[PDB]
Design a protein around this nucleic acid. Structure first.
Ligand SMILES: [K+]
Ligand SMILES: [K+]
Ligand SMILES: [K+]
Ligand SMILES: [K+]
Ligand SMILES: [K+]
Ligand SMILES: [K+]
Ligand SMILES: [K+]
Ligand SMILES: [K+]
Ligand SMILES: [K+]
Ligand SMILES: [K+]
Ligand SMILES: [K+]
Ligand SMILES: [K+]
Ligand SMILES: [K+]
Ligand SMILES: [K+]
Ligand SMILES: [K+]
Ligand SMILES: [K+]
Ligand SMILES: [K+]
Ligand SMILES: [K+]
Ligand SMILES: [K+]
Ligand SMILES: [K+]
Ligand SMILES: [Mg+2]
Ligand SMILES: [Mg+2]
Ligand SMILES: [Mg+2]
Ligand SMILES: [Mg+2]
Ligand SMILES: [Mg+2]
Ligand SMILES: [Mg+2]
Ligand SMILES: [Mg+2]
Ligand SMILES: [Mg+2]
Ligand SMILES: [Mg+2]
Ligand SMILES: [Mg+2]
Ligand SMILES: [Mg+2]
Ligand SMILES: [Mg+2]
Ligand SMILES: [Mg+2]
Ligand SMILES: [Mg+2]
Ligand SMILES: [Mg+2]
Ligand SMILES: [Mg+2]
Ligand SMILES: [Mg+2]
Ligand SMILES: [Mg+2]
Ligand SMILES: [Mg+2]
Ligand SMILES: [Mg+2]
Ligand SMILES: [Mg+2]
Ligand SMILES: [Mg+2]
Ligand SMILES: [Mg+2]
Ligand SMILES: [Mg+2]
Ligand SMILES: [Mg+2]
Ligand SMILES: [Mg+2]
Ligand SMILES: [Mg+2]
Ligand SMILES: [Mg+2]
Ligand SMILES: [Mg+2]
Ligand SMILES: [Mg+2]
Ligand SMILES: [Mg+2]
Ligand SMILES: [Mg+2]
Ligand SMILES: [Mg+2]
Ligand SMILES: [Mg+2]
Ligand SMILES: [Mg+2]
Ligand SMILES: [Mg+2]
Ligand SMILES: [Mg+2]
Ligand SMILES: [Mg+2]
Ligand SMILES: [Mg+2]
Ligand SMILES: [Mg+2]
Ligand SMILES: [Mg+2]
Ligand SMILES: [Mg+2]
Ligand SMILES: [Mg+2]
Ligand SMILES: [Mg+2]
Ligand SMILES: [Mg+2]
Ligand SMILES: [Mg+2]
Ligand SMILES: [Mg+2]
Ligand SMILES: [Mg+2]
Ligand SMILES: [Mg+2]
Ligand SMILES: [Mg+2]
Ligand SMILES: [Mg+2]
Ligand SMILES: [Mg+2]
Ligand SMILES: [Mg+2]
Ligand SMILES: [Mg+2]
Ligand SMILES: [Mg+2]
Ligand SMILES: [Mg+2]
Ligand SMILES: [Mg+2]
Ligand SMILES: [Mg+2]
Ligand SMILES: [Mg+2]
Ligand SMILES: [Mg+2]
Lengths: 62, 46, 102, 77, 93
RNA sequence: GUGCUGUGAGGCAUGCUGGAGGUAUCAGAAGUGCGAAUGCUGACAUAAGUAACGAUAAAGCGGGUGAAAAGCCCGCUCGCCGGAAGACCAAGGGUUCCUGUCCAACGUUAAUCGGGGCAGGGUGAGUCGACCCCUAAGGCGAGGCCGAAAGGCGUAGUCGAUG
RNA sequence: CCGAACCGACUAAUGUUGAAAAAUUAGCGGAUGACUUGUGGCUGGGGGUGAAAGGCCAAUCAAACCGGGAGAUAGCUGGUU
RNA sequence: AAGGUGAUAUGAACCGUUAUAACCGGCGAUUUCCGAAUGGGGAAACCCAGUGUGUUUCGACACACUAUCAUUAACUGAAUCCAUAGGUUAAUGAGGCGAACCGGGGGAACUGAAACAUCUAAGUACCCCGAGGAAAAGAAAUCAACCGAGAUUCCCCCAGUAGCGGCGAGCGAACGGGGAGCAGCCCAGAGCCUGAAUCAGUGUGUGUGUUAGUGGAAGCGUCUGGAAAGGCGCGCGAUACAGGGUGACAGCCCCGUACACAAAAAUGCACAUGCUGUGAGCUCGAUGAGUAGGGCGGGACACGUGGUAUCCUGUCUGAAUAUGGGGGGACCAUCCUCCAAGGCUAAAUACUCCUGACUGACCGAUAGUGAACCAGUACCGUGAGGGAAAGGCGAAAAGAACCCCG
């Protein structure tokens, strides 16, 4: 998924990162209350957050 | 009867703790020895 | 690469099921394969009140060493050996006996 | 430390020997003195801790030559 | 402002227990598991933004983890932070 | 285990057990032979079902639960402490706290009970305490002075409560 | 000065594989002082400290403990298949 | 690459199968706190700041700087007129850790001498400082013996010899010979001629490794058996019969092995070629002074003061300087030989915390590491420190459904 993210701009990456963090929080609430059946989604959003932060770091010349 | 071990955490740390060991070259050689032996607990420091 | 793959049709070389034929259902990283209908064992399954409880004596396949089976050459009707070669830039398997691609 | 700033003389170890030749460890110390040396070229006195031998070296070579040696060695005065 | 990225990390889970349930229906107080380094001010801002309720006051405490055996092996669970979050009257979570 | 065999250390054969290694001959090399060392390690005896079961404050009975109750729960009675054998802190310890469940081991007996096993729960502060400001004894200590080296002492400072 | 707390330790019995590697019980001395106690600090091994007994310095003291020189040395005792 | 989401360790929810599943390698990114720990402090993993940039919903938030010392530079700046000390700032460097080997500063005793003091143990153990991949040493003020050799280092001899020695216990060379390896240079200075040798750095090439990988020959029947790789029979491969696995012992079942190949990227080495610095040659000069030597006290030399050369120097002295000086084991003469008081230098040598491969008339659970196993753990101790025990179901869990006493 790093290819499609690499097209977006720094400002689009920051909006995407925020959206993932909200999703990660909602999943965390559902998991804790026992209302999450698809536990595999937790790892998925966690690694997506890492992908976005890596690209934000690559674009800053870092 | 009063026995020899009368615990006090402040005295324990001042006498044998990590920073007391680091304060002298002889104390740093204690730490070097215990690291070479591979101790899991280097000092009394909790 | 692996000479025996899942869904291959194999024939058993050694053991109580020597000479029998089946299809590879599972390849285990320990060098063993589950072959359909072959190395059958009778498991005394205790009932599990958590889910459904069909606790009884179940028959099921046990893993067998992968060197104890051979790829089955249906043309010759015999066990064969596998080689590797490159055709059209891709690596393929072929029967050692008649040199045909698997 | 008991070290001559001009020559680098410092304590050395050796033995006391008795008539029966019993050896006991001892030191030999340098003959050090703090002395104010007049530096004509800078119109001031510089105090050095020097052995009597070092004072003879300064008499021979001149305080300016000696002080240049000290600056080369990084020895502050 | 506390940044939204920080606010999204401080609340970990609701805390379910008899004392927590009694706290909710008797004093309008919800009990949360929060990040170990969260402050009372961070918890207050996160609840107000993410749960969309008005908070009166936050009380906190640190729960020390228990030593447990597991097949001879000895271990220790992690310390965690509990927050009693009193909501303003009329609010409902 | 048994039989045979040689002057001896030993050798050979074979039944049973065992379930995968063994090794002639002639040479070669040794961590090469154990009953003692108040030898070393582990196992198991003896005394012996003996001494003892940890303050001579003390128990009795009815009911409950339970496979089982002198010891647990409830009740009535009795006795013991009461400048403590009551209540509450600091220190020290660190979950021993509460609830459910279990009785192998632990508990000097039994145990349905437990500071025991397992699981869940429980510690909410502007005012209490710590942190914090301030210093004592004392410690460290830029430069500094001193010392073969390591280091010693100490100024400005900076720490240090038991205040 | 008499006498509890508190600090001691003169006598006796018990205990001596103890309830306890120094105690228990009945008596005993000091108890406003050269008193007693909490917390923290300082002194280090031929060294400390000692109202002085070679006392005490972590159940160790006519030279602490730990590691090293180290397999010290043993004209002695034991053992040697 | 057709499988996969590390182990205990099943399950759950999932990913993938022709190439963004997983896995392996190169290069990157992220990398909390403590620790030299460096913003101040501190009972390690904690407490408390300053300054500047931003941001703000006025509650606040984010980020970056801020140790010490050394050197250099700038600005500033006392007593004190110039000055100097001092002060501030900046740049660059250092500190800490690590098994051995290496150089240096200090330096025991037990023991042996059948006691013991000289002597020995021994410049050992140990403490300290410093360096490197090696270190140190090194280009004759060296030996030799009237013939000659030609820096240093290491190995074999010389030789337990010559000597030293309460002439006791003990200590113990050199000359000379055979080998490994081999290399020579610069400053103390001008002129000429010039940028010429030579090393160091940095680019670029070509090879050659290292860090993933690819292909890799040839067996069936029958007997015993739970199972064949064993027996018996008949075949086949071999530049591959090293080794490991598979239900008993397999060249031909599997993984390998011989052999033949492979790199996007990073990197080692040896060449080549750039760029930078370095200076090459000739000539004429110069030739290391509180030094050599001496007196006194010690130490080092195999050599214990001895008839004792030579070396080092704590103390007091003190030349000649090439028409000169050092050495040749007291000393003198003669002769021979060398040129101190400035410095650099590869190789042969020492070691192994660590990585890979291979090997053993080495061990096989009281052995071998203390530790085959979650061991420097449990446990013991205030602490330094001390320090265990504990391996094996089966080929495969097929690890015993169900019934019975309790
Ligand atoms: K102390
Ligand atoms: K037999
Ligand atoms: K047998
Ligand atoms: K014995
Ligand atoms: K008995
Ligand atoms: K008991
Ligand atoms: K009983
Ligand atoms: K007092
Ligand atoms: K004394
Ligand atoms: K002790
Ligand atoms: K002593
Ligand atoms: K730090
Ligand atoms: K001696
Ligand atoms: K003797
Ligand atoms: K003697
Ligand atoms: K096989
Ligand atoms: K094989
Ligand atoms: K001499
Ligand atoms: K050991
Ligand atoms: K052992
Ligand atoms: Mg001596
Ligand atoms: Mg409140
Ligand atoms: Mg609180
Ligand atoms: Mg043989
Ligand atoms: Mg033996
Ligand atoms: Mg025996
Ligand atoms: Mg015997
Ligand atoms: Mg006995
Ligand atoms: Mg016994
Ligand atoms: Mg009985
Ligand atoms: Mg009897
Ligand atoms: Mg009796
Ligand atoms: Mg009795
Ligand atoms: Mg009792
Ligand atoms: Mg009753
Ligand atoms: Mg009773
Ligand atoms: Mg517990
Ligand atoms: Mg309780
Ligand atoms: Mg309970
Ligand atoms: Mg019992
Ligand atoms: Mg019972
Ligand atoms: Mg319980
Ligand atoms: Mg309990
Ligand atoms: Mg100081
Ligand atoms: Mg200083
Ligand atoms: Mg002070
Ligand atoms: Mg203060
Ligand atoms: Mg206080
Ligand atoms: Mg007394
Ligand atoms: Mg009494
Ligand atoms: Mg009186
Ligand atoms: Mg009185
Ligand atoms: Mg000592
Ligand atoms: Mg006496
Ligand atoms: Mg004592
Ligand atoms: Mg003594
Ligand atoms: Mg010795
Ligand atoms: Mg001995
Ligand atoms: Mg600091
Ligand atoms: Mg800091
Ligand atoms: Mg402070
Ligand atoms: Mg260093
Ligand atoms: Mg002797
Ligand atoms: Mg060198
Ligand atoms: Mg000649
Ligand atoms: Mg391959
Ligand atoms: Mg092959
Ligand atoms: Mg066969
Ligand atoms: Mg077998
Ligand atoms: Mg010269
Ligand atoms: Mg000379
Ligand atoms: Mg001299
Ligand atoms: Mg002389
Ligand atoms: Mg002399
Ligand atoms: Mg002289
Ligand atoms: Mg001479
Ligand atoms: Mg001569
Ligand atoms: Mg062992
Ligand atoms: Mg065994
Ligand atoms: Mg302890």
């Amino acid at each position: 998924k790093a290819k499609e993210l690499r097209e977006k701009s720094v400002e689009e990456l920051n909006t995407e990162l925020l959206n993932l963090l909200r999703e990660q929080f909602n999943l965390r609430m559902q998991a804790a209350s026992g209302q999450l059946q698809q536990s595999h989604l937790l790892k998925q959003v966690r690694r997506d957050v890492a992908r976005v932060k890596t690209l934000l770091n690559e674009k800053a010349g870092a | 009867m009063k026995r020899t071990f009368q615990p006090s955490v402040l005295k324990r740390n001042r006498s044998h703790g990590f920073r007391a060991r680091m304060a002298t070259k002889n104390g740093r050689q204690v730490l070097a020895r215990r690291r070479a032996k591979g101790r899991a607990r280097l000092t009394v420091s909790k | 690469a692996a000479k025996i793959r899942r869904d291959d049709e194999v024939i058993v070389l050694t053991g109580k099921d020597k000479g029998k034929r089946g299809k590879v259902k599972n390849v285990l990283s320990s060098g063993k394969v589950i072959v359909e209908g072959i190395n059958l064992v009778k498991k005394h399954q205790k009932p599990v009140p958590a889910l459904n409880q069909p606790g009884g004596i179940v028959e099921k396949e046990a893993a067998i060493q992968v060197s104890n089976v051979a790829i089955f050459n249906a043309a010759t009707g015999k066990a064969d050996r596998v080689g590797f070669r490159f055709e059209d830039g891709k690596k393929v398997r072929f029967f050692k006996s008649n040199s045909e691609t698997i | 430390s008991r070290v001559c700033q001009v020559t680098g003389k410092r304590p050395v170890t050796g033995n006391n020997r008795s008539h029966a030749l019993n050896a006991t460890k001892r030191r030999f110390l340098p003959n050090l003195h703090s002395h104010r040396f007049w530096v004509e070229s800078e119109k001031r006195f510089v105090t050095l801790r020097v052995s009597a031998k070092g004072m003879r070296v300064i008499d021979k070579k001149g305080i300016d030559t000696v002080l240049a040696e000290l600056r080369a060695r990084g020895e502050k005065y | 402002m506390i940044r939204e990225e920080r606010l999204l990390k401080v609340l970990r889970a609701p805390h379910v227990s008899e004392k927590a349930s009694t706290a909710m229906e008797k004093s309008n107080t919800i009990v949360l598991k929060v990040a170990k380094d969260a402050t009372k001010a961070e918890i207050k801002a996160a609840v107000q933004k993410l749960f969309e309720v008005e908070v009166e006051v936050v009380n906190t405490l640190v729960v020390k983890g228990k030593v447990k055996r597991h097949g001879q092996r000895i271990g220790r669970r992690s310390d965690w932070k509990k927050a009693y979050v009193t909501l303003k009257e009329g609010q409902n979570l």
